[PDB]
Known about the structure:
Indian hedgehog protein N-product, signaling protein, alpha+beta sandwich
Amino acid sequence: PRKLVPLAYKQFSPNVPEKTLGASGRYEGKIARSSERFKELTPNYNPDIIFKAERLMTQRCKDRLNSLAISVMNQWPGVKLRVTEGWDEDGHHSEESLHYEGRAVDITTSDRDRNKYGLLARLAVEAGFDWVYYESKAHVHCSVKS
Ligand SMILES: [Zn+2]
């Protein structure tokens, strides 16, 4: 067994830029409702995840999130994974955010205990998200390749 080490504030894993090939890969452009690429987005209705649209994400993102949902409930009995941002149609992030193509989620615990977020980030990496960034005290940013 291995010690699960929480990510530090502002740490990202792996320790490379999000868009690198060993991470979540290149930005592919915004996905609009009208896009053909919009049909690669699937809604996530996992009853074990709290959703603050936020539900629309790629299959790989869905798989990683659902895996995380289990691990969080294990880590903290009685607590659930919570999503506060998923697919963004409204330019609320940087120039080229993976949020714009349904390949990123910002997450917390259901109890909004910010002291848990570093460990939540570690669980996200263990759950297979291709890039995990303890971006803010308000949430952890998790993304996947396409
Ligand atoms: Zn984010």
